[PDB]
Nucleic acid binder design. Structure first.
Length: 66
RNA sequence: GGUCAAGAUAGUAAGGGUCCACGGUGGAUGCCCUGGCGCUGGAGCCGAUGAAGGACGCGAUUACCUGCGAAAAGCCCCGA
């Protein structure tokens, strides 16, 4: 979610995690359009989640290739 | 008391005037500060790593502002 249990993943295993959230985020976007969003907090959570993956994939790119 | 005569004089206000009472309109005066001005001192350049300044966006709901920038009213570390 946030500490060291996030960086264990390989190359395509990072792009995979993003894609699964973007898809969920879109299913929620469609849910919003048809008056079905009972859990709006889920929206920001996934956006915070995708941000974290994208931030870390840049940390590890510099904590190796310098 | 009655009739006639000769006199003289009053009230009525359609509307108006002055004063009084009570309102309405209006935003002066007073009180206040959420905002300004001056002087004294501090500080004093930003930009091809893309500035000043903008456009369009980012909200469960978002028209304006603010804050951001497709990682979008926020993501990571250190300190309080």
């Amino acid at each position: 979610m946030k500490p060291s249990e996030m960086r264990n993943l390989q190359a395509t295993d990072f792009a995979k995690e993003i894609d699964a959230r973007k898809k969920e985020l879109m299913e929620l976007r469609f849910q919003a359009a048809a008056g079905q969003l009972a859990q709006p907090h889920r929206v920001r959570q996934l956006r915070r989640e995708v941000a974290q993956l994208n931030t870390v994939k840049a940390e590890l790119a510099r904590k190796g290739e310098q």
